[PDB]
């Protein structure tokens, strides 16, 4: 009655019989931009069902040695379905997100994944190792797309900050002996009412194993982690030709 759940939006429905409730980032549901917060004057377009639906974008394999991965929003969807087209044809974009991370195993497997959302997740480099070289991360690392990217130094989140304090952000855990999914609802987070879906990534989704995956020889060794997400209250403005970046 808190373990079972159904998430229906658009022409897609998700089910889970081993949930752990739902998290609503910073305690507030997504919403459309009010006429007093807005600034751009053109009438926005709100596609609704064609873009506010669940998209399953990627599957990673959880291994005994995995370090963790991250994805950037809205980067992950800029080239998928109708949402992508609208993000490409419009200068302005804004929306919320419902993130559903899936990972099931057996009552004999163990391990725990920390699933968290970190706004304005700026990536840092190791500065040439000695820290005397001012290097910068490449586009494929700041905006990895749907395939995401693997963390090199999870302890410091590849940005000189302690992952041990990541729980100060909207998060959930996937502890195999307890639940097989994590659901986080995120409102639009920015210092502006609208912004570019291409140049700016509002937040990053981190999925990091804190307690290593383990099991005995003979049990299914392939344990996938699938990422499904849905935009909420998508709004677009500033129409012109399509642009990919």
């Amino acid at each position: 009655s808190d373990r079972v759940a159904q998430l229906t939006i658009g022409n897609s429905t998700i089910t889970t019989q081993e949930a752990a409730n739902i998290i609503v980032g910073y305690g507030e549901w997504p919403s459309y931009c009010s006429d007093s917060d807005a600034t751009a004057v053109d009438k926005p377009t709100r596609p609704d069902v064609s873009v506010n639906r669940f998209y399953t974008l990627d599957t990673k394999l959880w291994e005994k040695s995995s370090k963790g991965w991250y994805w950037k929003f809205p980067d992950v969807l800029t080239e998928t379905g109708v949402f992508g087209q609208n993000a490409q044809f419009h200068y302005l974009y804004r929306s919320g997100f419902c993130i559903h991370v899936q990972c099931n195993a057996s009552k004999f497997h163990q391990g725990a994944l920390l699933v968290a959302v970190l706004p304005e997740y700026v990536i840092g480099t190791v500065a040439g190792g000695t820290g005397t070289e001012d290097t910068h991360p490449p586009y494929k690392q700041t905006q990895p797309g749907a395939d995401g990217f693997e963390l090199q130094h999870p302890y410091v989140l590849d940005a000189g900050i302690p992952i041990s304090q990541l729980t100060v952000c909207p998060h959930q855990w996937i502890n195999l002996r307890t639940n097989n999914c994590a659901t986080i609802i995120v409102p639009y987070i920015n210092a502006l009412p609208f912004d570019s879906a291409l140049n700016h990534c509002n937040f990053g989704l981190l999925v990091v194993p804190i307690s290593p995956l383990d099991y005995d020889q003979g049990a299914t060794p392939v344990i996938p982690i699938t990422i499904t997400l849905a935009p909420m209250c998508s709004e677009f403005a500033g129409l012109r030709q399509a642009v990919t970046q």
């Binding site: 304005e120 700026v122 190791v126 989140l157 000189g160 302690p162 855990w173 210092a191």
Partner: protein, 297 residues
């Protein structure tokens, strides 16, 4: 007009962001109520499910037998203004006589407070901040001596001409705000408003400032947010002839009327550069101290 049902009953356009939580006044630490032994089935405060993502709701009252304690300890000193409204160093400007830096009697400093660790680490606890600020300017020679010298500080906002010499025409300062003061006078001090084009300044921007191909040679612009670039602070000795004294200007900032959003993990690796969170990859250190065994102090 609207006639088909799905349109009439849609929530498309709801601008009211529903909030699950609300603030309550809390001027003092919560009190402790009396409690006694409880030997029940069904009731189990001690057991939690951290997976949910929420913190434990268990309290002293339900874990041990407590007494009543009227707690009048204030919560005042942990407000944002209490924490930040304390002047700290955010900039140094040298005006040497014989040097390799600013030997021409003037200097331009890009307003950027991320050059000093103490102040930087405090503001980076939050992602977005909006505030006014009080700026204090302390001048003296490199020995701390006070000399009879007149200086001119001028705030050059983006787009205004940056002085290129001690006699530059821009010092006419007909529109930009300038302060003329003596090293003998007390430190100059002024109030600065919230000047960003955005609703708040942001210590982190996971994006690029422009469109196009973001090739290797432009990656230095990743994370650069013009909304945070308030301009230049220019200083000069007032005269057509070189100063007789070497000078140093220390800049202190005191935030006030502060609002902050989105807390984040606190820096645990030394800082290296102003513009980014780069860290020395070969010196990744634990967040804190360590010990020999988990079973020994």
């Amino acid at each position: 007009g609207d006639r088909v049902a799905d349109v009439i009953e849609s929530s498309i356009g709801d601008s009211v962001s529903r909030a699950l939580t609300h603030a309550l006044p809390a001027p003092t630490g919560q009190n402790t109520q009396v409690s006694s032994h409880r030997l029940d089935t069904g009731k189990v405060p001690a057991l939690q499910a951290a997976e949910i993502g929420a913190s434990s709701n268990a309290s002293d009252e339900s874990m041990i037998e407590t007494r009543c304690v009227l707690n009048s300890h204030s919560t005042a000193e942990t407000t944002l203004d209490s924490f930040f409204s304390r002047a700290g160093l955010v900039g140094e400007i040298d005006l040497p006589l014989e040097g390799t830096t600013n030997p021409n009697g003037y200097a331009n400093w890009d307003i950027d407070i991320t050059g000093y660790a103490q102040m930087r680490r405090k503001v980076e606890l939050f992602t977005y901040m909006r505030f006014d600020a009080e700026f204090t300017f302390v001048a003296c020679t490199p020995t701390g001596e006070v000399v009879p010298q007149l200086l001119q500080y001028m705030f050059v906002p983006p787009g205004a001409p940056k002085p290129d010499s001690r006699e530059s025409l821009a010092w006419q300062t007909a529109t930009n705000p300038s302060v003329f003061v003596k090293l003998s006078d007390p430190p100059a001090q002024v109030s600065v408003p919230f000047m960003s084009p955005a609703s708040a300044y942001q210590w982190f921007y996971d994006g690029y400032p422009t469109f196009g191909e973001h090739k290797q040679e432009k990656d230095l612009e990743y994370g650069a947010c013009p909304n945070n670039m308030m301009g230049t602070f220019s200083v000069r000795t007032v005269g057509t002839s070189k100063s007789k004294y070497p000078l140093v200007v220390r800049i202190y900032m005191r935030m006030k009327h502060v609002r902050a959003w989105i807390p984040r993990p606190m820096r645990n690796q030394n800082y290296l550069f102003k513009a980014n969170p780069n860290y020395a990859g070969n010196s990744i250190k634990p967040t804190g101290a360590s010990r020999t065994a988990i079973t020994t102090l």
